[PDB]
Design a binder for these strands. Structure first.
Ligand SMILES: [Zn+2]
Ligand SMILES: [Zn+2]
Lengths: 1095, 67, 49
RNA sequence: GUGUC
DNA sequence: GACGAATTTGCGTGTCTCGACACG
């Protein structure tokens, strides 16, 4: 027995209260509008014209305000998110700057100068939805359970997906189609993205960069950098017997070509280099700040760069001859990208554009002036900034050629189908690779990721790993500086690389220090370095988000402080024991001693993927060994948000887990606290949502017990007459009549109407009365005397909702009556009439439709078991066992073994025991409740102990030989009803380009007959039907051509021969005639030769 | 949203004991004590009141009120 | 083998798009390319004189 | 672009 | 001994890289 603290389950809620799931999406933006927005202002700080050096403007301070709207005339009132969501407006706040400009001779300092607007997040620091109370949240008509984190642009909720990319400022050594090759990608803050690569062929190293014409020898690059004597070159490379046999050839081919001085190498390079000022200076400045710009050069010293290239060559040599290769599947190198730095790049590019083009606005006015003073605030504009921001957010085209980048599909509309689909989309992560079949590694589950990305959470289909979700406990590190870090490392006793030569780095005892892909120097006895750095980090002086690791195969220590790293807290242990005790957590339960002081007391700490590489972590407290360094808080935090709804995930199989986590976001239910006020395009709601009996701790963490998307129902696992085939399930007619599974659909119909540049307008006449009696006509029946439909009415098929009459171009008006198209008979809920930002009237209507479950509706079991309903059985059937309880949904026992789902029976047992006793049973992953204490509790009541009951068949009236498995199960209703998945067409509209059925059901189109279905008709050998349903029913056309010269005539007449003597006709599909008429314009004339079918 | 008037499986009226169940949960009574004192004995007509959420109460705070 | 006379295809092979947005027409890319190459046919005849 | 087979 | 002819091999470039339905 070992002392075990059963209290560490309350650390996780206190940790999520600080940050975590979605609070980091707001942290990245709150830090960006407080730190980087002024860094960009300081970057572009002074700009002046060149006409005469007397005019200039200066940037003092910049800041943003609160969400405000500019109405008719100087009307700035605080607007709420719901108002912007209903008025199709955009949630944004202005950016007021305090700049100074010199006009004439004196200087003018105009305070509070507006330059544009910028969108603000829903739960950010500048918004009104922060620090409020639920009573006040109900005052602004907003759900308090809304996590937020999206953008409202033109009345839609847009969220920016997190995108993962590879690490920059690092060396990779990977193998390709022939051999091994090293590469280096360089990209700092300033826009300079470079990709250099060193390759090996014929025992000769060659350096490739897109600025050079062809290969340049590495020894030539060395001699050009400044290292002249060939001895210290090999000294820097490596002093070993096997590294010289591979470096001799290059040295001797270098001696072959007559290059022995720096000027010779520089002239050689300049002659090699092509670019569209002499050759020596060209080659000098090209080796200075073009190839590797992440290694700064003070005056003109290429020593750090040449030692960097030498250690790169040494890594390539040690990779050469072995099977040690670097892969891109490691997640310790992969970095994440939020919406903060994207907005940063967008804003800095827009600001640079606005500063550089306005520099040209006052550059054509100074010589061609009219007075002595020039005002610049009247030569100022505030539409490009707002336009660019809104366009980049809504459109989704991140195109920055100043940054040399084009990205599509970054922002997406927030899924508002259910409460899980909304939160689960915020943790969705996108990859940099495109959706292709070639990938198998990155799609495969990597052993590197542990507790950072949910393994089960992934969509099944085409993308099978390109889309991943975050874990419950993880944190994204923001960027820092490295001043104090380098200072403390220099004080610890690290050596300057500029003093010692190349020979000492080959020493095994010597270790190299790397900081964000930068060589700081040489350190001996790296263990003391790592220990002291870790102790200083645990102290509190250095920030906690600084990684340190050591690698012995290449003998280098890495110090990582870049932003975008994954961090999760771990409990520290000291030589046999966790530092956290019972007295430390009793205070946390009391109300003091929270997470931040726990970190300040050196009891827990963050570790990254690369830092946990050199650490031992214990799963539980009974497996703690003498080399374990950290202790994982809880093992059930590995599962994600969508995987936390599955009872007993370890009992279930991974395909079923994936199916269920994918179907959890499609399950329909309640949306939030304000679903009657919000008017979305499509909304699915339930009538009476029940509460899951067997709930999970993750359910309580997210508070899913307030917005459930399912219902509890009695299930009987047994075969029925004939309608529980592979996935079919049987319903109870009496239960369906009582109201089990009642659904509601809400559709939106919005119409905007505006004015024009002339005095033309739009108008709504309204209803039409006849001459016999005073009744509205059948066309306009629901319309009110105003001209719109009144709520609380019933609209049938092809009836007018609103009359819209607009002029053709006194003027003639064409009426465009909006007509409702639907197979069902809809109902009107409410009507909203408002105005938008551009002075146009907007009329919105919400249409309600109540539906009941029928044969052809898809249901799930919340265990990866989906099926359409089979036969609807009345209550005379569906046998009761003893008390008179009938099966609500009949389940088939034949789909259990193949699917291999054992958690379903355990969940049923736990739910039955709970509904009998009267308390909810915990079913969390890697724990919960067992099947030993629950079955003995099912005996006290009087039922059987595991699952069995005596049933009496109803259709015959005889008992059942074998026993049946009865119990309550949490079922959920999904989308894709048979009411919408039902189409039929005989003769409808056709396209103008080709006479063929159009695409889609919204335009009443047909079905497509592809080649794979044509192959089935060909393999049979039927020719009449193959021609009947491709030419007779699709497009039958009668064309005419001539016998003298094969050409398409008209009206039995040719324009080439100008004679109707040789004229005949035939039957051809319109597609073939169109192809002929298209090819005749390509200098390809299909001269046809007719004949009699008798011939 | 609202407690169902009748049960789904058997059809027993379970909508006349919701307010009584609420008022009996504040007299220092256990969930099982309230459930077996109200009159529910079987479990098909017992999870209607036990596992039930009340969202119309939160939906009336956003409801139109007269001034 | 050398093109010096271009054949204008029929007008029914290049339908025009109409918008219920801006009282707007949208031509085919073939028509736009034809109007762009005909403008090149008149800019050379003006430069010789 | 998203969702299902 | 010196020049015209024919062989083998490293290197340049173009084409795709299953089907279906529904919604905005
Ligand atoms: Zn002819
Ligand atoms: Zn009942």
């Amino acid at each position: 027995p070992i002392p075990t603290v059963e209290e560490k389950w309350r650390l996780l809620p206190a940790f999520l209260k600080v940050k975590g799931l979605v609070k980091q999406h707001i942290d990245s933006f709150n830090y960006f509008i407080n730190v980087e927005i002024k860094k960009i202002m300081k970057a572009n700080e002074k700009v002046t014209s060149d006409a005469d050096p007397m005019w200039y403007l200066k940037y003092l301070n910049i800041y943003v305000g609160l969400p405000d709207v500019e109405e008719s005339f100087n009307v700035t009132r605080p607007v709420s998110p719901h108002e912007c969501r209903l008025r199709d407006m955009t949630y944004s706040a202005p950016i007021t700057v305090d700049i100074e400009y010199t006009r004439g001779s004196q200087r003018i300092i105009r305070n509070a100068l507006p330059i544009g607007r910028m969108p603000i997040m829903l739960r950010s620091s500048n918004c009104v939805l922060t620090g409020k109370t639920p009573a006040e949240f109900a005052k602004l008509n907003e759900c308090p359970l809304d996590p937020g984190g999206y953008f409202i642009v033109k009345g839609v909720e847009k969220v920016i997906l997190i995108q993962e990319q590879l690490s920059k400022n690092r060396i990779i050594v990977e193998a390709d189609r022939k051999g091994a090759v090293g590469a280096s990608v360089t990209s700092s803050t300033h826009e300079k993205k470079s990709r250099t690569n060193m390759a090996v062929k014929q025992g000769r190293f060659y350096l490739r960069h897109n600025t050079l014409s062809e290969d340049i020898p590495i020894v030539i690059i060395f001699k050009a950098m400044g290292v002249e004597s060939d001895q210290e070159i090999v000294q820097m490379i490596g002093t070993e017997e096997h590294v010289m046999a591979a470096f001799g050839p290059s040295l001797e081919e270098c001696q072959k070509a007559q290059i022995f001085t720096q000027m010779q190498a520089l002239k050689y390079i300049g002659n090699k280099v092509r670019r569209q000022k002499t050759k020596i200076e060209e080659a000098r400045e090209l080796l200075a700040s073009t190839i590797l710009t992440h290694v700064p050069v003070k005056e003109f010293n290429f020593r750090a760069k040449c030692i960097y290239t030498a250690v790169m060559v040494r890594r390539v040599i040690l990779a050469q001859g072995d099977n040690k290769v670097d892969d891109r599947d490691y997640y310790g190198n992969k970095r994440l990208e939020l919406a903060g730095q994207l907005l940063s790049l967008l804003f800095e590019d827009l600001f640079k554009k606005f500063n550089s083009e306005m520099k040209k606005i006052a550059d054509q006015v100074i010589p061609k002036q009219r007075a002595a003073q020039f005002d610049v605030v009247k030569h100022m504009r505030q539409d490009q900034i707002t336009n660019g921001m809104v366009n980049a957010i809504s459109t989704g085209n991140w195109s920055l050629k100043r940054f040399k980048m084009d990205r599509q599909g970054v922002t997406q509309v927030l899924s508002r189908l259910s409460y899980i689909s909304a939160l689960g989309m915020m943790t969705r992560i996108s990859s940099q690779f495109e959706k292709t079949r070639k990938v198998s590694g990155p799609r495969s589950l990597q052993p590197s990721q542990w507790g950072m990305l949910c393994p089960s959470d992934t969509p099944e289909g085409e993308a099978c790993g390109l889309v991943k979700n975050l874990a419950l406990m993880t944190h994204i590190t923001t960027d820092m500086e490295d001043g104090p870090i380098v200072k403390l490392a220099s004080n610890l006793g690290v050596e300057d690389v500029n003093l010692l030569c190349g020979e000492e780095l080959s020493y095994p005892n010597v270790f190299l220090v790397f900081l964000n892909g930068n060589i700081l120097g040489v350190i001996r006895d790296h263990k003391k370095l790592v220990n002291t750095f870790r102790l200083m980090r645990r102290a509190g002086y250095i920030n906690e988000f600084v990684s340190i690791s050591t690698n012995l195969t290449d003998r280098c220590v890495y110090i990582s402080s870049d932003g975008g790293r994954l961090c999760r807290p771990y409990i520290i242990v000291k030589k046999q024991k966790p530092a956290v005790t019972n007295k430390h957590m009793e205070e946390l339960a009391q109300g003091y001693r929270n997470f931040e002081d726990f970190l300040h007391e050196s009891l827990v700490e963050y570790l990254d993927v690369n830092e946990e590489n050199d650490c031992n972590i214990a799963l539980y407290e009974h497996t703690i060994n003498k080399d374990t360094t950290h202790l994982e808080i809880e093992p059930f935090t590995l599962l994600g948000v969508c995987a936390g709804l599955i009872p007993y995930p370890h009992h279930n199989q991974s395909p079923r887990n994936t199916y269920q986590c994918a179907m959890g976001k499609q399950a329909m239910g309640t949306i939030g606290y304000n679903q009657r006020n919000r008017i979305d395009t499509l909304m699915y709601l339930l009538a009476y949502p029940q509460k899951p009996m067997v709930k999970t701790k993750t359910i309580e963490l997210i508070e899913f017990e307030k917005l459930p998307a399912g219902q509890n129902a009695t299930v009987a696992v047994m075969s029925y007459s004939g309608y529980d085939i592979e996935d079919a399930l049987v319903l109870n007619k009496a239960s369906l009549d009582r109201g089990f599974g009642r659904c509601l659909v809400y559709k939106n119909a919005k119409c905007t109407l505006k004015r024009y540049t002339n005095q033309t307008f739009d108008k709504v006449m309204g209803p039409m009365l006849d001459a016999a009696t005073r009744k509205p006509i059948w066309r306009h029946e629901i319309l009110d005397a105003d001209g719109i439909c009144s709520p609380g009415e019933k609209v049938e098929n092809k009836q007018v909702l609103v009359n819209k009459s607009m002029p053709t171009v006194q003027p003639q008006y064409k009426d465009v009556p909006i007509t409702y198209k639907g197979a069902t008979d809809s109902y009107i809920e409410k009507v909203m009439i408002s105005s938008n930002a551009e002075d146009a009237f907007l009329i919105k209507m919400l249409l309600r439709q109540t539906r009941r479950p029928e044969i052809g509706d898809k249901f799930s079991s919340r265990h990866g078991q989906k099926g359409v309903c089979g036969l609807i059985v009345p209550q005379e059937d569906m046998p009761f066992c003893d008390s008179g309880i009938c099966p609500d949904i009949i389940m088939n026992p034949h789909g259990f073994p193949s699917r291999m789902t054992v958690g379903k029976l355990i969940e049923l047992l736990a739910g039955k025991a709970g509904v009998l006793d009267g308390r909810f049973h915990y079913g969390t992953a890697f724990g919960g409740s067992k099947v030993k204490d629950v079955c003995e509790d099912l005996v006290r009541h009087g039922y059987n102990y595991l699952g069995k009951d005596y049933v009496t068949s109803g259709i015959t009236g005889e008992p059942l030989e074998a026993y049946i498995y009865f119990g309550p199960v949490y079922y959920q209703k999904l989308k894709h009803m048979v009411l919408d998945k039902m189409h039929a067409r005989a003769r409808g509209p056709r396209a103008v380009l080709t006479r063929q059925p159009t695409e889609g059901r919204s335009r009443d189109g047909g079905l497509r007959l592809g080649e794979m279905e044509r192959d089935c008709l060909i393999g049979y050998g039927a020719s009449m039907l193959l021609l009947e349903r491709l030419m007779i029913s699709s497009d039958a056309f009668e064309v005419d051509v001539c016998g003298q010269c094969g050409l398409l005539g008209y009206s039995g007449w040719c324009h080439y021969c100008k004679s109707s003597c040789h004229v005949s006709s035939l039957r051809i599909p319109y597609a073939c005639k169109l192809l002929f008429q298209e090819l005749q314009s390509m200098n390809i004339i299909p001269r046809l030769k007719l004949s009699k079918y008798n011939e | 949203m609202i407690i169902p008037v009748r049960c789904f499986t058997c059809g027993k009226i379970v909508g006349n004991k919701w307010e009584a169940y609420l008022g009996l949960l504040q007299a220092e009574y256990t969930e099982g004590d309230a459930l077996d004192a109200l009159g529910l004995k079987r479990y098909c007509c017992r999870r209607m009141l036990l596992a039930h959420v009340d969202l119309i109460e939160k939906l009336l705070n956003y409801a139109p009120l007269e001034k | 083998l050398i093109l010096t006379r271009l054949l204008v295809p029929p007008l029914c092979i290049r339908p025009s798009v109409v918008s219920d947005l801006k009282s707007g027409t949208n031509e085919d890319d073939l028509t736009m390319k034809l109007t762009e190459i005909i403008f090149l046919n008149d800019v050379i005849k003006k430069h010789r004189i």
